[PDB]
């Protein structure tokens, strides 16, 4: 590469030197994508090599085998793994794609074209040509729309996707007639982010999942066409900063928001993130504890409708802030839990006291007890559950992992968006290097006092 | 010495050899700071890897038993030892080193050598400030960490029952010490500790603010995009625009600094004052003289069964510390408490 | 030519001539934090007791109900509501709003908007005055800590009752139950944060000592020694070299902080990144990632448990576990 | 060395030190009033 005196950038800012070398920039990008699929394939292969079939799949600390298993590849009508060959072939394909992508990245990083306008005008670009930048954005939007539509095609015609809400305890369900109601989808995207509505995480069925995917793929394709055949409006030019630093900052803000969304999804979602593959969420393993001690104490012969616990509220049942019947324990905050093994137990009145007394199925019993034992506690050094507990079990919840790691990544990426946004604004304005020292703007205005 | 004859003796030769420019300077304090500090760090490192604490505390606090960096600690002697200096030649060890260990003697060795090493380190700062002919504001600042060291590792065990109640040189033992003051002393509620917390938090605030403001108002001073290459010690002009910084913080915060001297003296003053206030509070707790309770709130809680606040909750959690933790932390006191008299509420 | 109303409005908003710069981030500055501060003052003065834990056990928290400012605290939102966004209009009455902990949600949400807009306003004044803008990036650490303690921990644990009480003794209670349920003291991110504030105090004292030490005679024992020259001169002769020489001769002469720019960059970044680390540690605690649990880890050849400092810390942790939220439990093990 | 004192000095308290001292006194007050009232 080059050195500091010809670029003004130190070694710890060396990738800034690629701000104008588009060929080396795309080479670094494709080598990076090769790194991403290399981690994907290597983790698939290692995780299959370290896989135990009879033990349920969320107890080995498994984060992306549930990602394939949610798609319905190699899983039975109860979350049983049966075969791991789909996972194996996915990992091997990712490894080979990593090899070819890394080859391309190394080639363009070393003996690729230094600059692209002198050889490839279709790939040549500056950071100021709004039409060309929107053309690239349109190409990527078309690719992402095709990627979402590929999942739509799989869920529709390819015999996949694991419905945890299927009767019996979840099954690989072929989704027919997904709900593409614009009112429903927009209501999901504009509802409250709090616990009453959940904004985007409270999606509860594959029909709405695939309908929203249809909507996103459709708008992504049409927006790709729109950005290819258009040029930004004057209000967009006046409101935006058009440079490579600014574009990076906008992308960093968007991907940090995405990281926070994924953190909340991994912690709270139970439909797109099956509990059979990821362990219990936040509300369950506590609502599961409540329901299990409810059914145990009604089996021992007590009257759970009596309850009337230590504070005069109810050891098992309680009325929520609204008139629905909910659990009376300390899990009275999670009463908005909707899970597969409570909904046939739940009706318009509440928790359906008669169904609590009579209609409780043994699969619901077993699922609730198992979700009690494997709570989403766990400590960072493995070890057991609560921080006061001891070295008894080796289990940390993959939901806890995918929440903590993704919050950390999202927070640093919000910080990185702030850094690059401020630097892009200061670079476009010119005073990124500092104050000019011969005409400082402070002496250009009157003093405050 | 005032244009006198000043006949040269061995002292002048020794001073001439000590005040020399080397890789590491020695000076007069090198007669004390170097051996005392090297012995302190070596004693702590040796006790954290081999010297067990099975005899005194009934626990493992060394790497040779199954402990990590966050678990091993050079532990204090037993409470029955009281406040002995606990020499290897004293009535305790009677000249035997292999049993001078596992009896808390290495803790006293490390503590005394560390105290004298801190003494030598302030003498170090003083005499180097003399050699460079600058004011010893560094020693002025360093007077506070050693005040904390004395008030914590000497004054507090000296005023309490013995070295056993001092912090052991480690990590998790320090955490035990922290929870010990939490439950047994309610050290958060002590106003001097509140001052110490305010001083440290304000000092970190000043650190971040000063660094960010100087690094964001540092002028151009060149043509390269890297600002660090634009600094030159040969020029006498200031690196950053203090008038720009003052205007920025005046329009953001409402108040801003106008004098570099007052800025840096504030950065000097806040942690020193906070640490001295915390040292005074620990001197208060050395005599078991606590800011433990509020009379009006405890009387109101006693005569009102439905009036409760976070202070009452804190008192209850302190009782949780004492009842469930003194039984194992004080093996000399022999707490064979039945676990139906310990305060333990619903389910948990 | 600014003869239209909204052009003059954007000029007055954008202008730096006001005593306090408002800005386009300032238009969300002023109303949000005045709303939060008004509700905070009124609640702290005369709020009725707030049912925090949802078991009809209210915490008084307000001075007029019989506590001082040390033990007084704006109590968190109720456990019954959870993180369900309950504002005044969702309450049937102001009394019900005050009983279920509505002012806590009000102040916390408005304070979160206020701190994000204070970040943006710092950047905005940096832009209008033409400096470098990363002062907001440095301030991104205490705001990260504030969000982690105020909204992210309630999001992770499921209810705003889990958040920090707006007070002092409530802060102590939240911290203690935090140690009880998460073992924060034995977490590397928390150790990084503690090291960061300790090093912040150390480096602040060290920088103040090295700058105030490296001075020349211009202010004598009197107010000012201006007899050589009064105010109105640009002669910069404070000191440039002796502070770095002292710092080199202190230990080994190769800790090169001759570059004052590099010195100030490190001085800024060390406590900022460490508070970033501890804020992320608290956010991870929200999702029950907990601390190092080396309890019963030391065993002899017979497998019998050998006690340790970690076991003592574990005993204290369970002692705070069995006391907090006195009558909130029904079921044995504690799940969020 | 004579009848008037050449060592006489006048006291100077600027507004910044005024505000800092007042803030110091009232912060000590809010810290210790709750404890003296007890």
């Amino acid at each position: 590469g080059r050195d500091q005196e010809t670029t003004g950038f130190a070694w710890w800012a060396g990738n800034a030197r690629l701000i104008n070398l588009s060929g080396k920039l795309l080479g670094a990008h494709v080598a990076h994508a090769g790194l991403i699929v290399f981690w994907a394939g290597a983790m698939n292969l290692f995780e299959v090599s370290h896989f135990v079939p009879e033990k349920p799949m969320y107890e080995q600390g498994l984060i992306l085998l549930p990602h394939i298993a949610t798609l319905g590849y190699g899983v039975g009508p109860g979350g049983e793994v049966l075969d791991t060959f789909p996972y194996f072939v996915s990992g091997v394909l990712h490894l080979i794609s990593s090899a070819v992508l890394g080859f391309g990245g190394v080639y363009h990083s070393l003996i690729g074209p230094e600059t692209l306008e002198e050889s490839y005008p279709f790939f040549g670009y500056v950071w100021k040509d709004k039409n060309k930048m929107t053309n690239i954005l349109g190409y990527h939007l078309i690719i992402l729309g095709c990627g979402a539509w590929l999942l739509v095609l799989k869920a529709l015609y390819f015999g996949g996707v694991y419905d945890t809400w299927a009767p019996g305890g979840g099954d690989v369900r072929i989704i027919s007639n997904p709900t593409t109601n614009a009112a429903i989808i927009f209501g999901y995207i504009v509802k409250s982010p709090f616990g009453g509505d959940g904004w985007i995480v409270s999606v509860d069925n594959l029909e709405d999942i695939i309908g929203g995917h249809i909507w996103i793929g459709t708008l992504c394709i049409l927006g790709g066409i729109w950005h290819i055949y258009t040029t930004p409006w004057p209000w967009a030019r006046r409101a935006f900063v058009w440079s490579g630093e600014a574009y990076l900052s906008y992308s960093l803000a968007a991907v940090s928001l995405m990281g926070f969304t994924a953190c909340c999804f991994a912690w709270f979602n139970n439909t797109a993130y099956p509990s059979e593959f990821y362990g219990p969420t936040g509300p369950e393993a506590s609502q599961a504890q409540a329901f299990t001690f409810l059914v145990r104490d009604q089996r021992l012969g007590a009257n759970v409708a009596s309850a009337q616990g230590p504070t005069g509220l109810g050891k098992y049942l309680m009325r929520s802030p609204t008139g629905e019947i909910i659990f009376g324990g300390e899990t009275m905050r999670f009463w908005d839990f909707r899970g597969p093994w409570v909904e046939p137990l739940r009706g318009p009145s509440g928790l359906d006291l008669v169904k609590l007394k009579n209609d409780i199925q043994p699969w619901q019993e077993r699922r609730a007890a198992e979700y009690m034992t494997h709570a989403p506690l766990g400590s960072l050094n493995s070890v057991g559950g609560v921080a006061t507990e001891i070295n008894a079990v080796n289990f940390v919840s993959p939901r806890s992992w995918l929440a903590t790691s993704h919050f950390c990544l999202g927070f640093f990426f919000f910080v990185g968006h702030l850094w690059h946004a401020g630097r892009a604004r200061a670079a476009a304005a010119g005073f990124e290097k500092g104050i000019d020292r011969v005409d400082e703007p402070v002496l250009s205005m009157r003093p405050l006092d | 010495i005032g244009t006198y004859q000043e006949k040269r003796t061995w002292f002048d030769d020794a001073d001439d050899w000590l005040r020399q420019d080397r890789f590491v300077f020695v000076g007069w304090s090198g007669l004390l700071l170097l051996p005392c500090a090297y012995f302190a760090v070596g004693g702590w490192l040796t006790g954290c890897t081999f010297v067990t604490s099975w005899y005194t505390h009934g626990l493992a606090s060394s790497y040779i038993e199954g402990c990590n960096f966050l678990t091993a600690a050079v532990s204090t002697p037993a409470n029955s030892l009281g406040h002995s200096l606990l020499f290897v030649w004293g009535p305790e060890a009677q000249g035997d080193l292999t049993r001078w260990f596992q009896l808390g003697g290495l803790w006293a060795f490390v503590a005394l050598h560390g105290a004298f090493g801190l003494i030598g380190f302030m003498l170090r700062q003083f005499e180097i400030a003399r050699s460079v002919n600058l004011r010893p504001y560094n020693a002025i600042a360093f007077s506070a960490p050693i005040a904390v060291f004395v008030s914590v590792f000497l004054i507090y065990p000296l005023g309490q029952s013995g070295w056993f109640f001092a912090p052991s040189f480690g990590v998790a033992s320090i955490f035990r010490f922290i929870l010990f003051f939490q439950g047994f002393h309610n050290w958060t509620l002590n106003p001097f500790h509140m001052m110490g917390v305010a001083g440290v938090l304000g000092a970190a605030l000043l650190c971040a603010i000063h660094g960010a403001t100087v690094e964001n108002t540092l002028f151009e001073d060149g043509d390269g995009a890297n600002t660090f290459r634009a600094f030159n010690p040969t020029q006498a002009e200031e690196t950053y625009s203090m008038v720009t910084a003052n205007r920025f913080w005046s329009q953001i915060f409402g108040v801003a600094f106008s004098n570099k001297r007052w800025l840096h003296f504030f950065m000097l003053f806040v942690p020193v004052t906070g640490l001295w206030m915390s040292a005074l509070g620990v001197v208060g707790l050395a005599l078991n003289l606590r800011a433990y309770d509020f009379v009006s709130q405890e009387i109101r809680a006693a005569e009102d069964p439905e009036f409760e606040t976070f202070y009452t909750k804190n008192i209850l959690l302190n009782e949780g510390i004492r009842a469930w933790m003194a039984a194992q932390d004080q093996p000399h006191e022999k707490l064979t408490l039945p676990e139906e008299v310990l305060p333990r509420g619903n389910a948990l | 030519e600014n003869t239209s109303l909204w052009a003059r409005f954007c000029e007055w908003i954008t202008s730096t001539e006001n005593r306090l710069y408002i800005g386009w981030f300032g238009v969300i500055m002023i109303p949000t934090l005045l709303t939060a501060i008004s509700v905070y003052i009124i609640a702290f003065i005369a709020a009725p007791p707030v049912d925090i834990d949802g078991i009809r056990e209210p915490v008084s928290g307000s001075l007029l109900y019989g506590n001082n400012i040390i033990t007084g605290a704006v109590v968190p939102t109720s456990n019954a509501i959870g993180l369900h966004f309950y504002p005044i209009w969702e309450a049937a009455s102001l009394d019900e709003w005050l009983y279920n902990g509505g002012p806590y949600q009000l102040v916390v949400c408005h304070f979160f908007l206020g701190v994000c807009c204070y970040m943006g306003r710092e950047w905005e004044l940096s832009y209008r005055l033409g400096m470098r803008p990363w002062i907001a990036v440095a301030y991104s650490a205490p705001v990260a800590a504030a969000t982690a303690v105020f909204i992210i921990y309630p999001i992770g644990q499921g209810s705003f009752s889990d958040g920090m009480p707006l007070g002092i003794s409530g802060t102590f209670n939240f911290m203690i139950v935090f140690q009880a349920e998460h073992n924060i003291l034995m977490h590397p991110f928390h150790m990084f944060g503690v090291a960061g504030v300790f090093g912040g105090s150390l480096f602040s004292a060290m920088h103040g000592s090295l700058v105030t030490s490296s001075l020349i005679r211009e202010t004598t024992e009197n107010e000012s020694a201006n007899a050589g020259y009064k105010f109105g001169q640009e002669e910069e002769t404070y000191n440039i070299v002796a502070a770095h020489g002292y710092f080199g001769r202190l230990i080994f002469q190769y800790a090169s902080f001759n570059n004052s720019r590099s010195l100030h960059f490190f001085l800024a970044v060390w406590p900022v990144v460490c508070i970033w680390l501890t804020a992320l540690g608290i956010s991870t605690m929200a999702f029950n990632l907990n601390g190092f649990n080396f309890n019963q880890s030391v065993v002899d050849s017979n497998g019998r448990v050998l006690n340790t400092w970690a076991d003592i810390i574990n005993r204290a942790n369970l002692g705070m576990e069995v006391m907090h939220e006195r009558n909130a439990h029904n079921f044995p093990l504690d799940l969020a | 060395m004579a009848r008037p004192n050449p060592n006489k000095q006048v006291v100077e308290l600027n507004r910044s030190s005024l505000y800092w001292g007042l803030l110091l006194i009232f912060v000590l007050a809010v810290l210790f009033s709750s404890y003296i009232f007890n």
């Binding site: 003093p447 006092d449 | 003052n246 | 003065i45 001075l63 | 910044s16 803030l23």
Partner: peptide, 30 residues
């Protein structure tokens, strides 16, 4: 008068910081 004295002290702190923000001495020497 239990709460009123803390009220006086808090109002005094707020008044002092308000006066320090607005009725401050102007920043001289740079």
């Amino acid at each position: 008068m239990e709460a009123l004295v803390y009220t006086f002290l808090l109002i005094g702190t707020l008044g002092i910081i308000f006066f320090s923000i607005f009725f401050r001495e102007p920043p001289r020497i740079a």
